[PDB]
């Protein structure tokens, strides 16, 4: 999930999670408009502090000062809660990154064909994230990661991993500061959306170029024309 789409208005996503009384997020009618969100950019990230939901632009990536590789962008659900590197983020830096769907590139010989993956029921996805608090500082090295899970069923045809997507109800509980890391591990297990809830189709190769951000990037295409 090295790219995803976050294109609709804030209300389009937040209405599934909480009414205004629970938010500390200004009204804004403008669609976010990003059909091709990439690592290293700041992404509107949802979290809870001071008993309200906040939406902060947070660097997609995590690279402590001691980390000598490109920033990580994912953390595996299998191990993140006990990882020496991720355990504090699992306990104190949980967040949600909402989106319309995500992209994966399927290997077809020496060619790589992009696919867009989304909920068959037409809801947005609430991706489980962990990251470095305080999110509002706008850090440019230690931001957030998208938690991943194994692909199963038809999704394995496309790629072997996928974002850990939570139900709206589970996403709301995941963000609460009052629940422990152990409780969060239970939420991740019980609230994960299974693979048969997703649909997918090939899309234009143009999504590979981050200059492109338009709605055409999630439209289905014939592979034969690419």
Is position 192 annotated as part of the catalytic site? no
How far lies 127's CA from each of 79, 81, 111, 193, 224, in Å? 17, 16, 28, 10, 32
Q: Which of 48, 97, 104, 142 is catalytic?
A: 104
**Backbone torsions φ then ψ of 57, nearest 5 degrees:** -75, 115
Asked about 104 being catalytic, the answer comes back as yes
Structural contact between residues 6 and 45, judged by C-beta atoms closer than 8 angstroms: no
Q: Which among 210, 174, 183 is positioned nearest to 46, based on CA atoms?
A: 174
List, as own/partner pairs, every contact residues 184-193 make where C-beta atoms lie below 8 angstroms and the sequence separation is at least 24, other chains included. Answer: 184/81, 184/90, 184/91, 184/94, 185/81, 185/90, 188/77, 188/128, 188/147, 188/164, 191/166, 191/167, 192/77, 192/149, 192/164, 192/165, 192/166, 193/119, 193/125, 193/165, 193/166, 193/167
- Residue tagged 């060619």 (tokens): 111
The token pair that represents 148 in the structure block: 């991943």
**Active-site residue, selected from the candidate residues 1, 48, 97, 142:** 1
* 115 close to 200: Cβ distance less than 8 angstroms: yes
Q: Which residues are part of the catalytic machinery?
A: 1, 104
């Amino acid at each position: 999930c090295g790219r995803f789409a976050q294109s609709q208005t804030r209300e389009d996503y937040l209405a599934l999670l909480a009414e205004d009384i629970e938010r500390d997020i200004p009204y804004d009618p403008e669609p976010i408009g990003r059909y091709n969100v990439a690592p290293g950019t700041k992404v509107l990230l949802l979290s809870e502090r001071d008993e309200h939901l906040h939406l902060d632009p947070v660097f997609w990536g995590y690279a402590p000062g001691w980390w000598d590789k490109p920033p990580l962008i994912n953390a595996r659900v299998e191990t993140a809660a006990t990882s020496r590197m991720f355990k504090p983020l699992w306990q104190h830096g949980r967040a949600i990154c909402f989106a319309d769907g995500w992209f994966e590139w399927k290997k077809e010989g020496d060619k790589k064909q992009p696919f867009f993956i989304y909920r068959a029921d037409g809801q947005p996805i609430f991706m489980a994230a962990i990251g470095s608090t305080p999110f509002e500082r706008g850090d440019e090295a230690e931001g957030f990661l998208i938690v991943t899970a194994a692909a199963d069923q038809g999704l394995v045809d496309i790629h072997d991993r996928r974002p850990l997507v939570l139900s709206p109800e589970a996403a709301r509980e995941w963000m609460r500061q009052e629940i422990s890391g152990k409780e969060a591990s239970e939420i991740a297990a019980s609230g994960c959306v299974p693979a048969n809830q997703f649909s997918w189709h090939p899309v234009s190769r143009a999504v590979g170029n981050v200059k492109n951000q338009g709605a055409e990037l999630i439209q289905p295409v014939l592979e034969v024309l690419f």
